[PDB]
């Protein structure tokens with residue numbers, strides 16, 4: 531019954547992907563942002579200028595207050611609220627209903643986005659990072675523990691405003707081509723992985739592979755960009771600037787604030803390089819790579835000056851808190867979060883990103899020595 535979940539995600543570019551859910555009794559319908567970078571299920575529960583609707587506890591006969599507060603500070607944005615429980619279901623998901631923890635958001639800061647169509651957040655990562663502490667069982671743990679839904683999910687995030695699929699409980703073989711390559715989940719808190727090699731247009735960055743994972747690398751659908759630690763971001767940008775020196779862009783573009791434009795249909799894709807991330811494999815001394823096209827890290831932005839040009843923002847940004855494989859990296863791949871086997875699988879998506887010459891890829895096997903030395907401590 532996975533066909534029912536195909537195309538159950540929507541979103542706007544740079545504004546995440548959301549799925550429809552219901553909370554309470556009688557059911558209250560809300561759009562919920564799908565976030566593999568956090569572990570709290572939370573929904574707006576008080577008026578807010580950017581909310582079209584909100585969770586009204588006073589109307590749900592199944593609401594149970596927990597007499598406990600909560601706040602979550604993300605990389606950017608934060609909210610606070612009240613903890614409680616209620617019945618939750620996913621209309622275009624498994625045909626079940628679970629009692630789960632819910633944070634009713636009463637105040638927020640730079641969290642809700644003006645005109646985004648979602649009103650809450652579904653953190654799908656592990657208890658270790660739940661707020662206030664790891665005793666607040668996350669939604670997906672509740673789902674698996676109360677139903678027979680198998681302990682895994684897969685995300686097919688599509689670019690161009692955007693759609694996708696979240697298969698809860700398995701893999702839908704019509705959503706990808708080729709082979710699935712698995713990398714171990716290093717530790718169950720974020721979806722942490724180990725990057726063992728980085729190449730740009732086929733040229734190795736020749737860095738201590740510990741630099742790629744300082745102080746961690748994660749798979750995070752709640753983050754738009756590919757976020758790279760200081761030393762890696764500098765090497766990658768320098769490499770990307772040189773490959774595209776044919777044309778000139780403001781330094782505010784390489785800082786991810788200014789947008790570059792071109793005539794409608796003349797974007798010089800061929801001057802921007804492909805980025806290959808090599809990930810630790812399942813077998814000794816074995817890795818595999820995923821190749822990112824520029825159509826992925828040049829995020830198209832809606833120019834409302836003259837809707838006659840193609841404009842983009844550079845979606846690779848600097849980090850001081852580790853590598854983040856954000857939504858633009860996940861886009862065009864089918865990503866399997868195999869919690870049951872502590873591994874994350876990658877395959878070319880059915881909605882893969884098109885270049886009339888190059889293609890995104892997931893290729894292996896590759897031999898890599900001393901992969902364990904690349905994890906940071």
Ligand SMILES: CC(C)c1ccc2c(c1)[C@@H](NC[C@@H](O)[C@@H]1C[C@H](C)CCCCCCCCC(=O)N(C)[C@@H](C)C(=O)N1)CC(C)(C)O2
Nearest residue numbers: 544545546567568603604605606607659750752753754851
């Ligand atoms: C568990 C939580 C406390 C936490 C704390 C730190 C933290 C993360 C999670 C990890 N995931 C972060 C992730 O969950 C958060 C979730 C967002 C607030 C969800 C709402 C906005 C979704 C649509 C616009 C995305 C813009 C974007 O890209 N935004 C807002 C990054 C900067 C971000 O922060 N997105 C990443 C990392 C580096 C490990 O840092």
